[PDB]
Amino acid sequence: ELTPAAPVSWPDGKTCAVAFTFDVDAESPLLTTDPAFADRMGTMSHQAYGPLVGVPRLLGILDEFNVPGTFFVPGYTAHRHPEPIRSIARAGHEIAHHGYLHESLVGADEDTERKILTRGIEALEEVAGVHPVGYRAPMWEMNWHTPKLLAEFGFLYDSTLMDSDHPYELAVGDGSLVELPVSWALDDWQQYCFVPDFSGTGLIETPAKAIELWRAELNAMRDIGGAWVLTNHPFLSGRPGRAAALREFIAEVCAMDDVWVAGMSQIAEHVRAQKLTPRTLTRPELT
């Protein structure tokens, strides 16, 4: 009988936790899908906007409001854009693992996954001297064998699963891994992404519509007392109008006295110190 995740107690009289997170995907989701995307200068320029413009713009916004940010960086982004990635670490923001070439884990065996985890840790170490304690699977998809590899690599937390509003201890072998759950609604990819021959049907929402959608989710989460995890991509949300609406929303959230605006590893550490009973879903069985 799988228990649903229960509410966690938050610190400092706070009753909701909020994390602003950024997946610095840049070119990597396209290159892993089809390496011939490398030849598309137009498309590669749209992707390069994230690390080149979006990353400094978003860091200026986080710094204006003294907000911790968590940047999930694919190792290949770090190798192709080391000055943008180092600027994140230099600004004092946490960097977390997001694969090497943002590889799909669908069909991946344990050995393939283990090589990608090493390759991403080494790139982030080389480029920015960071050893990530956090992970998010590219494309928010992972295998039933993935958490044990994350445990083997000593990761503090994962932020990939969507079966809860509350953080929890994901049971892994004879231990656990903190889970900081996400949702497709709390992602700018479905709001702004348009990349011909790759992603998006042509629908490009207004920045007000996107904030509206997140604000309705946040107000509800404040009543639930969960961990509200927002995911944005610098090549999308770093654009002028979207960044300007995220800045206004961030100002609004920092003004909420009931909310703990925090880094992902700080959230995960606070959860870990609660010594919760681990839980996990199991693979669906079919006769």
- Give the one entry of Zn ion, a copy of itself, Cl ion, none that residue 43 binds, where binding means its C-beta sits below a cut-off of 5 to 8 angstroms depending on kind: a copy of itself
Q: Is 63 annotated as a binding residue?
A: no
Least distance in Å: CB of 29 to Zn ion? 6
Q: Which of 29, 147, 234, 263 binds Cl ion (CB under 5 A)?
A: 234
Q: Which of 5, 18, 19, 24 binds Cl ion (CB under 5 A)?
A: 24
Q: Which of 56, 91, 266, 269 binds a copy of itself (CB under 8 A)?
A: 56
Residue 255 is a binding residue for a copy of itself (CB under 8 A):
no
Applying the rule CB under 8 A, the residues between 26 and 55 that interact with a copy of itself are 27, 31, 35, 38-46, 48-49, 52-53
Applying the rule CB under 8 A, the residues between 171 and 200 that interact with a copy of itself are 181, 183-185, 189-196, 199-200
Nearer to a copy of itself, 16 or 124 (CB): 16
Contacts with Zn ion, residue ranges (CB under 5 A): 23, 25
Applying the rule CB under 8 A, the residues between 189 and 248 that interact with a copy of itself are 189-196, 199-204, 206-209, 212-213, 216-217, 219-221, 223-224, 226, 239-241, 243-245
- Give burial (CB, 10 Å; 0-12/13-18/19+) of 239: middle
Name the segment binding a copy of itself (CB under 8 A); options: 62-70, 75-83, 250-258, 261-269.
75-83
Binding site for Cl ion (CB under 5 A): 24-26, 50, 233-235
Binding residues for Zn(2+): 23, 25, 98, 102
